[PDB]
Amino acid sequence: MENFQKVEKIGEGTYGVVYKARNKLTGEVVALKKIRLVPSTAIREISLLKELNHPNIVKLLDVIHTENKLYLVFEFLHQDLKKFMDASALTGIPLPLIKSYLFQLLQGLAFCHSHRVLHRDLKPQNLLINTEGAIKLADFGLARAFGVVTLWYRAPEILLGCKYYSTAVDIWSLGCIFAEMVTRRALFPGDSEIDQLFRIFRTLGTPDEVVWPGVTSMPDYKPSFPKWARQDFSKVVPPLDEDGRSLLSQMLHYDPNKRISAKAALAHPFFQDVTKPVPHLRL
Numbered sequence: 001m002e003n004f005q006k007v008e009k010i011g012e013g014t015y016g017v018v019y020k021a022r023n024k025l026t027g028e029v030v031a032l033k034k035i036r037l038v039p040s041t042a043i044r045e046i047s048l049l050k051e052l053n054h055p056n057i058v059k060l061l062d063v064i065h066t067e068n069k070l071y072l073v074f075e076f077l078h079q080d081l082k083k084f085m086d087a088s089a090l091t092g093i094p095l096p097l098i099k100s101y102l103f104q105l106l107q108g109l110a111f112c113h114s115h116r117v118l119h120r121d122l123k124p125q126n127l128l129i130n131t132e133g134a135i136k137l138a139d140f141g142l143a144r145a146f147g148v149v150t151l152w153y154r155a156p157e158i159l160l161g162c163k164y165y166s167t168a169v170d171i172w173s174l175g176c177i178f179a180e181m182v183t184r185r186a187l188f189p190g191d192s193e194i195d196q197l198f199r200i201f202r203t204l205g206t207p208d209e210v211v212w213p214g215v216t217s218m219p220d221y222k223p224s225f226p227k228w229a230r231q232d233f234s235k236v237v238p239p240l241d242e243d244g245r246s247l248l249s250q251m252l253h254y255d256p257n258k259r260i261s262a263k264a265a266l267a268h269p270f271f272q273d274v275t276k277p278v279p280h281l282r283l
């Protein structure tokens with residue numbers, strides 16, 4: 001760690017504090033994450049993530065295991081989607097830019113999912129943007145490598161106690177983020193696990209055996225859950241057009257098996273006119 005000069009704290013992530021730092025020998029500017037606790041399985045799993053490169057994935061440059069402490073060295077980007085959405089709150093992110101960002105994030109998910117790597121904790125704070133119009137997902141695979149607080153983007157199967165969740169959890173989180181970019185407000189801002197679950201039910205309807213076979217047998221499912229009627233997406237994400245609402249509805253299906261995959265979502269008619277605009281970034 002003597003090879004790195006810390007510039008400033010970037011933030012406090014799920015698995016540790018992130019710092020902007022300079023590599024003293026190469027002059028490289030990086031993001032350094034100090035993992036808060038090292039287990040041998042975690043080292044091997046993290047080491048496999050170093051081989052996982054894609055233009056829409058934040059590069060894991062190095063794993064440093066020293067003095068019983070673990071540091072992850074990553075590619076640095078200048079802004080996260082949270083700060084960008086806050087800066088764009090008065091005017092809204094232009095629809096062509098939301099579409100480009102959604103398309104790129106789906107390419108990133110499709111890539112990780114093809115390698116059986118899941119994120120599990122997607123949120124605006126771990127989506128990073130640059131001046132070229134790119135957006136990249138940070139922290140893929142860390143949840144599985146380390147094991148085990150914003151609940152807003154959590155898939156209903158996780159909230160209902162499914163232990164063996166799938167790649168569909170990331171599609172759910174990304175659907176939530178897509179809605180938030182469009183409306184400029186969080187879709188499901190729950191402040192407890194039950195409030196998160198009930199906010200989902202009040203919008204999409206309380207799930208039942210018809211829409212989600214096996215739901216009633218889930219570990220945390222209670223027959224005493226109130227039964228709310230589903231709402232129209234036209235009320236949920238105005239002024240998003242029919243193509244966007246159709247795609248979003250597929251990303252927010254209750255049954256993880258019915259939920260659209262990243263690969264199938266890339267083929268959705270919503271992306272027929274996708275482009276790559278340049279955002280106005282104030283750094």
Ligand SMILES: NS(=O)(=O)c1ccc(N/N=C2\C(=O)Nc3ccc4[nH]nnc4c32)cc1
Pocket residue numbers: 010011013018030031033058074075076077078079080083084125126128138139
């Ligand atoms: N709020 S803000 O716009 O001023 C702002 C600016 C830069 C950053 N960068 N973050 C990270 C980075 O560059 N690489 C990684 C890799 C893994 C991570 N996990 N969590 N974060 C990261 C980051 C985040 C927020």
